Amino acid sequence: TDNTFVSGNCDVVIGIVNNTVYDPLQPELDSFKEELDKYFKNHTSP
Amino acid sequence: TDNTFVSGNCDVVIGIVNNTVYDPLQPELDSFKEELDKYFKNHTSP
Amino acid sequence: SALLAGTITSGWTFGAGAALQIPFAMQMAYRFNGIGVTQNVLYENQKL
Ligand SMILES: *[C@@H]1O[C@H](CO)[C@@H](O[C@@H]2O[C@H](CO)[C@@H](O[C@H]3O[C@H](CO)[C@@H](O)[C@H](O)[C@@H]3O)[C@H](O)[C@H]2NC(C)=O)[C@H](O)[C@H]1NC(C)=O
Ligand SMILES: *[C@@H]1O[C@H](CO)[C@@H](O[C@@H]2O[C@H](CO)[C@@H](O[C@H]3O[C@H](CO)[C@@H](O)[C@H](O)[C@@H]3O)[C@H](O)[C@H]2NC(C)=O)[C@H](O)[C@H]1NC(C)=O
Ligand SMILES: *[C@@H]1O[C@H](CO)[C@@H](O)[C@H](O)[C@H]1NC(C)=O
Ligand SMILES: *[C@@H]1O[C@H](CO)[C@@H](O)[C@H](O)[C@H]1NC(C)=O
Ligand SMILES: *[C@@H]1O[C@H](CO)[C@@H](O)[C@H](O)[C@H]1NC(C)=O
Numbered sequence A, B: 001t002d003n004t005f006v007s008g009n010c011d012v013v014i015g016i017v018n019n020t021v022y023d024p025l026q027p028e029l030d031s032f033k034e035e036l037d038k039y040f041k042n043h044t045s046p
Numbered sequence C: 001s002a003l004l005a006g007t008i009t010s011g012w013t014f015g016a017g018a019a020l021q022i023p024f025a026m027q028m029a030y031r032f033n034g035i036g037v038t039q040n041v042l043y044e045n046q047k048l
Helices: A026-042 B025-044 C002-010 C024-034
Strands: none
Touching (some): A026 B025
């Protein structure tokens, strides 16, 4: 997403292809979710 | 904020108006707040 | 007069086709942006 911009759905671009597009925001929120889970799990033990 | 840069404050620009600027980080984190707060709620249960 | 009046009211747009109106200060912003001094630097100094 830092390299690319968007317009419309794929029904219009002739010769378009499918590939997964990486969001460099996402694993930074996934890691912050695994950090978060740890806080949730530890908060069970006391 | 992905379309726009920032510089200075709303005194200097002749003819500047008022309008919201939408940040795609924000509801990407607000859905992370409601994902979080429901894990706070269920952890109160056991 | 037509070249000058076209310019001050429409910028380069009459050179391509029909004239498109644009506020001058803003236009000058596109100019500044063309020589790479980012358009804020005009509006932040418009009086000067
Ligand atoms: C890239 O992904 C596209 C969407 O995931 C995919 O388009 C989908 O292709 C399938 C298989 O051809 C279609 O499956 C349906 O085909 C017709 C209706 O179109 C039905 O008779 C069938 O029973 C079946 O349900 C999908 O409809 C179609 N989706 C869309 C939105 O068009 C592309 O094929 C993928 N391309 C590559 C190169 O991987
Ligand atoms: C565009 O939105 C701005 C933010 O809402 C708005 O600024 C606000 O304007 C009012 C009226 O001028 C100010 O009201 C205060 O004015 C003085 C203090 O400066 C006090 O005597 C009053 O009791 C009152 O508290 C706001 O404080 C001011 N806020 C900010 C952050 O600037 C603009 O007026 C809006 N302009 C247009 C064109 O709609
Ligand atoms: C490209 O050319 C081949 C024939 O060599 C054809 O099968 C294919 O469908 C063409 N692709 C597009 C996007 O038109
Ligand atoms: C668990 O939480 C307590 C505070 O309640 C803290 O002292 C401790 O270091 C935490 N341990 C882990 C592994 O998160
Ligand atoms: C809450 O956590 C328990 C495990 O302690 C699980 O069984 C349950 O499905 C969870 N419910 C929600 C709404 O997360």
